[PDB]
């Protein structure tokens, strides 16, 4: 705008939380769909839903990770990364059913003398490959669901040889997007690129996507967030630079059905 408004400068407000950014590269709305509540024509559980509004639909900041020249990539699953986040988590665990959309805001700033580009991908149904060559589909629920902590990509497939006490975890090779497909094509998924000369952040608005109108949030993740270094971090002449990446996520239009006693999962 003529009196100063810009595509790089955004303010987002949800509940009692506000995010400001002075160096954005617009925002992505996945598949052109803004989040919405479940319509009566697509509804299925007949009981009155719980809709927590401002208490759950607000910005939760997860633990900050660190980007270095050794960094192969990081991944998170939704709703899993938010499972212990305030009243969103409580509402999630007290109900059999739940659905939610999300605003994902990835934060990474550096300086006009740094280089590097992060691919921020939102994958619907991000099924990842496990660590075994003798058995298939065997990653334990505990290993499959890291919570806020997330997981990482590796540059090398290294098979779990302990047949008597199997590790039962994923082994996500980065150029294969951890799922057997080439990373260069991951751009057909909703994404943004944090290229350090251009922007400090990525912002993706994600609708609820599923083959069902509502589902078990505890048994099933709808979206996976994959962040990979498309171009490695570099600074001045320092052989070992580091810059933080902070992930902040807000649930949107979340509703819950089937209230009963709280689910206490075996997470270890």
């Amino acid at each position: 705008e003529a009196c100063g408004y810009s595509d790089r400068v955004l303010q987002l407000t949800l509940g009692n939380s506000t995010i400001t950014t002075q160096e954005a590269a617009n925002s992505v709305v996945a598949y052109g769909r803004w989040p919405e509540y479940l319509r009566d024509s697509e509804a299925n559980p007949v009981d009155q839903p719980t809709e927590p509004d401002v208490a759950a639909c607000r910005f939760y900041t997860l633990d900050t990770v660190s980007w270095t020249k050794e960094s192969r990539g990081w991944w998170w699953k939704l709703p899993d990364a938010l499972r212990d986040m305030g009243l969103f988590g409580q509402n999630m665990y007290y109900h059999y059913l739940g659905r939610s959309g999300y605003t994902v805001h990835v934060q990474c700033n550096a300086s006009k003398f740094h280089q590097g580009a992060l691919g921020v991908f939102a994958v619907p149904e991000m099924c990842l490959a496990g660590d075994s060559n003798t058995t298939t589909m065997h990653t334990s629920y505990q290993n499959a669901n890291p919570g806020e902590k997330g997981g990482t990509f590796t540059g090398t497939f290294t098979p779990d040889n302990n047949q008597t006490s199997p590790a039962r975890r994923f082994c996500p090779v980065d150029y294969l997007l951890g799922n057997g497909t080439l990373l260069g094509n991951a751009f057909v998924f909703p994404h943004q690129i944090i290229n350090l000369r251009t922007n400090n952040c990525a912002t993706l608005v994600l609708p609820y996507v599923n083959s069902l109108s509502i589902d078990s949030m505890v048994k099933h993740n709808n979206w996976g967030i994959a962040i990979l270094p498309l171009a490695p971090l570099n600074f001045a002449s320092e052989s070992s630079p580091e810059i933080p990446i902070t992930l902040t996520i807000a649930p949107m239009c979340c509703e819950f059905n089937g209230l009963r006693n709280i689910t206490l999962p075996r997470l270890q």
Partner: protein
Amino acid sequence: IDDSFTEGGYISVFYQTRIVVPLSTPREMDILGFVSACNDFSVRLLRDTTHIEQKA
């Protein structure tokens, strides 16, 4: 006055990421803070201040 029954709460500031500088740039800097009232702010029951006095 400080009173638990009418306590206001807590302000705190944190680093979301970190301050990043290049080389040849100062690695330490200051921030200044300002406070003011919003248009919905009011005060009542006029009283004497403890911030000035006159011994003798």
